[PDB]
Every structure is written in C-alpha cells, then in structure tokens.
Symmetry: D2
Subunit: 217 residues, 4 copies
C-alpha cells in the first residue's frame, strides 16, 4: 500500500527501525585504503562504504515493496543526498527488472531539489500535486530541514509523502526508510561534507579535530 | 594541462576524437534483459549500457590526465547528465585513488545546475576556477553555448565540456564519448518527456514509444 | 522446466539464439583504456567487457527461468570460464534474491573441473542432479563432446551447456551469449598461451601478439 | 621488493596486521536483505559483504605495492577462496590499469588448486619453480592446510612464497596479507560453507544451531 495520509509525514509511523550503531563504535582508517588528500584527516570510520551499500539494498527492497506498480516520484536533496540517491535508484531499477511481478509503471520518476530558515532551489513544486512522493535525504539531526521543506511540499497537495534518510542522529522528525541510527557527532565522507570537503571519500568517517581546524570557514 | 584559454570554450581544440558510431548501427533489444515497462517500446539499442561504462572509464582517465594535481570544479547539468556524471565522478575518484600519485587536492569538487533557462546556486564561485561542464548530449549546441556565456561572465580560469554523446546534425565538447547519427535517443538517463531514464541501455525512440508518450 | 532428456545434450534444442556478431565487426582499441602490457598487442575489440556483462545478465535470467525452484549444480570449466562463471553466479544469486519468489533451494551449487584431459573431484555426485556446464567458448565442439560423455556415465537428471561465445567454424550450447566469426579471441579470460586473460575486453589476436607470445 | 626467502613461509614476517574484530561483535541479519533459503538459518552477521570488499581493496593495494613490475603467480584454493580470489584479481588488474607507474608485465598469472592429511588436486606444481607465488586462501584456523600445501610447493623450488587469507581465526601458521582476525567460531556465507551450503549468501555469518542441525552430514 503506497497510501499514507499527509498528516503522518515525519512521524515514522509503522516504519522498520534502522540499524543501531552504538556510541564509540568505529573502525580504524588505517585498515582501509585512504587517498592522500584524506590521509591526514581521517582517523575513525563509522560506516564503511560497503556497509552503507548493503544497508541501502535493504532500504530499496523496503521501498519497492511499498510502491510497486504505483507511480513514485523521488526527490533527491542536493548536494548531500547524491550518493545515497544514486545507490537507491540503481537498486530500485534492478529489483524491478529482476522481480517476478511485472508492472507497466517505471520504478520511479526522479527529481532534484537543492536545500541550504530553509532555502529551496527547485523546479515548480506543483508537479507533485496528487503524486506519491519520496524525499531522499542524507542525514536528519534536529529535523528542521525536513520539517520546513515538508511543510512547503504539503501546500501543493501531494497524494502521499514519505522520507528515506541514510542516517538519523541521536540528539524530532523521523524518516520512514532509515539506514542507520548514530551517536551525535559530525560525519564526513560518502557525500557528507565539512565545508564542501571530503565528499569523495568512500567511507563515513568522524570529523577529526585536524580536519575541522584545517577546513573551518 | 588544466590551463586553457576561455576563448577556446566549445571549440574542442586539441581533443581526442570520440568513438564513431556509424549510421544504422544498432543491437537488437531482444538480446538484452528489458523490463516490462520498456518492453513494448524499445527495439533498437544504439549503445549498450556496459559500452557506455567502458567509454566513460576512458573519458575519466583523459580528464584525470588533464586535471591531476589541480583544483577541479565539475558541474552536472540536471537532469539528463545525472547518470554520466555519477559514473564519471566514481571513475575519477577511483583512478586518483589507485594512481600511486600523491595530491593534496581531491579529484573534483561537485556542483549542480538545472537547464531546460538556468537554475543554480550563485555562479560567482567559479571565478578563477578550473571548470568542467558535464552534459549528456550536444545536438545543436545551443544549450551549452548559452550556459557557457553565462559562466564566462564570472571569469573562470578555464572551461571545458565533457559530453557523453555528440549528434552529427556548432559547439563541440572537449571529452566526448560517442559521435552518433542524428536520431532521438532514450535510456541511460536520456528521456522522452521524462520517460525511459531508468532503462539501462541507450536506445532509439521508436514509433510505439513516440505515440504513447507524445507531447 | 529443468527436466531435459540426456540424449538432447549438445543439440541446443529449444534454445534462444545468441546475439549475432557479423563478420569484420570490431571496435577500435584506441577508444578504450588499455593497460601498458596489452597496449602494443591489442588493436581490434570484438566484444567490449561491458557488452559481455549485459549479455551475461540476459543469460542468467534465461537460466533463472529454467531452473528456479529446482536444485542446480553448475560446473565451471577452468581456467577459461572463470570470468563468465563468476559473472553468471553473481547475476543468478542477485536475480533470485530480488525475484520476490520464495524458494528453499539456493540459486546454484558450484563445482569446478579443469580441462585441457580432465581434472576434477569424483563426478558420481552429479547422479540424478540437474547439471549446467559453464564454458568460455565452443569452437569445434570436441571439448564439450568428450566431457559430456564422461558425465553422462554417472546418470545426471539433466545436462545443459552455457557458453559465452560460439564460433561459426557440431555441438552447440543451450544458453549462448554471442555467435562470432571464426577468429582466435583473447581478453576477458580468453588467453593466448596464458597471456591476456586480465584484459577487460574481448579482442582478436593480432600479428604482434601472435609473434611475441608464439608457441 | 618481491623477494622473500622460502624459509619465511607462514611466519607473517613484516606483515601489516589485519583488521581486528573483537569477540561477540555482530550485526543483526534482520537489518540486511537475506534470501528465503537463508532466512531461517542466519542470525548474526560477522562481516557484511561490503566490509569484506573494502578490506580486500586494501589487501590488493598492499599486494600491488609488493609485486609491481614482477611476474606474479597467484593460486586460488578452491572451492572456498573463489569469492576472495575473484575480488582480489579484479582489484589487482584495476589498480595496475590506473597506476601512474607502467609495467610490461601483467598484474598476475592465475592458477587453481583444489584442497580437501591434505589432498591436492591441481596441474603439475613444477610450473611454479623459480616463480614468485602468492597462495590465496579463504580462512586459516589451525594452519594445517596451508602448512601441508606449502611444504609440497617448497619442494618444487619457487622463488618466493606468500599467503593472502581473508580471515584468520584466534585459536600456528600466519598469512602475509590478511583481511580480518576473528574469534574462534564457524563461519558461513561469502563463499564459506557448511557442508556445501550457504556459499551464495552475501555476508559472512556465524553458523547457527538451526543451520548446523539442518545441514549436518
Ligand atoms: O555533512 C554533514 N554531517 C553531519 O554530521 C550532519 N548532520 C547534519 N547535517 C546536515 O546539516 C543539516 C542538519 O539537518 P537538521 O536540519 O535535521 O539539523 C542538514 O543540511 C543535514 O543534511 C550534516 N552534514
Ligand atoms: O533525451 C534526449 N535525447 C536526445 O536525443 C537529445 N538530443 C538533444 N537532447 C537534449 O536537448 C538539448 C539538445 O541540445 P542542443 O542545445 O545542443 O540542441 C539538450 O537539453 C539535450 O540534453 C536530447 N535529449
Ligand atoms: O582463448 C581462446 N580463444 C579462442 O578463440 C578459442 N577457441 C577455442 N578455444 C578453446 O580451445 C578449445 C576450443 O574448443 P573446441 O573443442 O570446441 O574446439 C576450448 O578449450 C576452448 O576454450 C579458445 N580459447
Ligand atoms: O566454511 C568454513 N568456515 C570456518 O569457520 C572455517 N574454519 C576453517 N575452515 C576451513 O577448514 C579448514 C581449516 O583450516 P586449518 O587447516 O588451518 O584448520 C580449511 O579447509 C579452512 O578453509 C572453515 N571453513
Ligand atoms: Mg543537504
Ligand atoms: Mg553539507
Ligand atoms: Mg538536459
Ligand atoms: Mg530531457
Ligand atoms: Mg578452456
Ligand atoms: Mg586457453
Ligand atoms: Mg578450502
Ligand atoms: Mg569448506
């Protein structure tokens, strides 16, 4: 069932809980291949990139089970969600291609919105009126960003509104498809940045004091 | 060398010529796994998805040779270039990562602009930067000519274009994957009125497809 | 249906015809990223690596349709079929995993035999089993005719062949990727005296290559 | 330097230590997409498949640094090492293809040996005389298997002999390139089996009592 009353947006009603990552649990950067521009600044790896992919596969499957045979409009929140969104749509298409169930509806219709008080850079949001919408976000912390953007999308009157977020911090709005629950720390790598740096690093790391001082501004 | 005169933008001066795909050269869709939503509409495949990936690896290496050791700002033109851009940035990061060369600069810095008019963040941050515009296809050359003039006003250090496909139908790219005949393509992020982006291969738009998804 | 009479082995009875690659149809090596050790020797690419992967996905789906819900024993013929086998088993596991169908049987059980004569574990365990022999290429058909007779003696339940390539030069496979002209291929696990297996694309053996790596 | 005196075989002399996985550290199977034939039997995931790939990348790089421009003969121990070996050779070729250093020597020359008192099913081992050999193994526990096979290969007189093993158990011979150090438990998945079952599962799991009883024989 793709239906979900608008009023439920951000409640995480009937969700599958995310993978819980306890406090002070990290891998050492030295065990991974870290590139020279990252070497001085990465010490602790919270989520290896291949752990992120394995988790995204399970989210995708959850998503496909929810919307199969229903038109689905998926919104990528740029820039941060690029990595997670591109993995997710790759899985969604593949799952639908291999599924024994056959549908005449594509697996998803993609959209982009850039968020940076919330700023909204995007096409006219009216195209989402009466559509099933899935917001793909990289990380929710206080919930402010998705609460404001959600309020603005509700105004157009979508048919349904759900949230897929790769990480939620333990500090509030909650996503419907969430990969990981982590302790309240600043993360970089795997598309997470610190003043635009580290996005190209393959793993989700903790921001180091060395990084923070070198790239603060 | 990353340096290149701004006046050379769109001239494809000194480029490596793309892979030339001759007219009326196609693979049969029946030889590929085609999902149900595309099955009635896809007959001819111009570029198998795997061939796209092999060519994008060669372009990433060409781009790595050009910009290695220099700050590189890459602009994705949405929505069409999403797939090419995502493949390209993955190969650039990997190539640098395995190169055995030491650089203190990341392999790229990413940016996004949506064209259809323009929609983007403030463009003045490209001043005195090395910029690579990544696009899905160049046909008349109008889109990149127009966006190019807009960017030239902020005074970048250099401007190049990477385009997966150029049609033989005139602006040209610097890193181009394939030269094809003048036909409307769909699949691998190419669409016909927002349809077929998710198909894994580059195909020609058939009659059946044109009819059902018409204006 | 997994069932198939043992007497039909090698006849390609009821198969889906492979992708036909016409004579003198090649891509230029200069359009691909070719590593230094292959660079002097590779000129023409018959099958880009990505095209191989796209076709292997279609074969895995064909094999999934045939054996789903039945115990399937897959034999890799070493060393040549390593690459095809590894791609095939990855796609079969994934296809089953995402199929949304419930089966209590794994997508395959793997086995290995080395031919050049035979080298393998005891073959009697294939008695009353559904067997799929995975091979890199069939040319005269001698290798699979001979190994086939050996296996037939243990009384399998059914026997089929998956071959990535068949040359038009006669035994034929049941799941075949490509029909090519009669030429010696190298790359993508195809070798010339143990050379070129690691190259990512299927290429023709050139003169330069023949000379340097000769008998 | 590819050189290594034969006498050092199995000592792990001058190795990079593996990634240490503490006792009683597992992920829950429920957080992953587990296929129906595995669902009843997998409970605890020790090493997510994408964690294995990220670690294999770092081993490959270590291996490339050791043998670049030197002829390298790599032996896959079947059936168990298939997964690890195929990931490793894919990385090795790619690293050499992207390397700024150029060599006229291929990244590796592959070989297969099936081990099951040790049984050795293989081509004539004499082809390894005076060659640099790397044995690729899935898991070392007591060290018996690699000690016996190593003794048999020494007899032919290779130039050098090193061991790459994805996992070593904490119970003895040691590998030169080792991915993980784990507690002494029986593992399945990601090519590890229990009486031929579970190899196709994507993650390295702990054998469950339910699995053991269902597949014992
Ligand atoms: O790179 C990042 N590492 C983090 O640890 C982190 N926490 C929050 N964010 C981003 O900052 C904002 C926080 O989201 P909230 O509005 O819910 O507080 C949004 O823009 C979030 O995407 C992060 N970005
Ligand atoms: O999906 C598509 N299939 C095509 O065959 C095709 N040809 C051009 N285009 C898009 O339309 C414009 C063509 O660009 P020009 O300004 O160079 O003519 C740009 O916006 C191009 O992306 C295509 N899009
Ligand atoms: O690398 C290769 N490139 C080729 O073009 C080629 N043609 C045949 N073969 C191998 O030689 C034998 C051919 O099999 P037949 O028994 O069917 O003739 C089998 O052992 C095949 O694997 C090739 N190997
Ligand atoms: O599937 C497996 N899960 C395990 O936990 C495990 N421990 C050892 N092995 C295999 O059994 C033998 C043990 O190696 P040792 O000779 O060093 O004891 C060799 O055949 C090893 O590869 C395992 N296989
Ligand atoms: Mg953001
Ligand atoms: Mg940010
Ligand atoms: Mg466009
Ligand atoms: Mg378009
Ligand atoms: Mg062979
Ligand atoms: Mg051969
Ligand atoms: Mg073994
Ligand atoms: Mg075993």
């Amino acid at each position: 069932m793709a239906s979900k009353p608008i009023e439920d947006y951000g409640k995480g009603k009937g969700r599958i809980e995310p993978m819980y990552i306890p406090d002070n649990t990290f891998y050492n950067a030295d065990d991974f291949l870290v590139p020279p521009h990252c070497k001085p600044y990465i010490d602790k790896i919270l989520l290896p990139g291949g752990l992120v992919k394995d988790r995204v596969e399970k989210l995708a499957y959850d998503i496909h089970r929810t919307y199969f045979g229903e038109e689905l409009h998926i919104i990528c929140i740029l820039k941060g969600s690029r990595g997670f969104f591109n993995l997710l749509i790759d899985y969604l298409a593949t799952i639908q291609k291999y599924s024994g169930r056959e549908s005449s509806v594509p697996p998803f219709f993609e959209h982009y919105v850039r968020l940076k008080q919330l700023t909204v850079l995007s096409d006219d949001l009216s195209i989402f009126r009466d559509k099933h919408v899935l917001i793909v976000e990289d990380i929710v912390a206080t919930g402010f960003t998705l609460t404001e953007f959600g309020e603005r999308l509700k105004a157009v009157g979508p048919k349904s509104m759900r949230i897929a977020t790769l990480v939620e911090k333990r500090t509030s709005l909650k996503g419907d498809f969430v990969g990981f629950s982590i302790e309240d720390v600043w993360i970089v790598g795997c598309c997470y940045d610190f003043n635009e740096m580290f996005r190209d690093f393959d793993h989700v790391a903790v921001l180091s004091d060395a990084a923070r001082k070198k790239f603060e501004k």
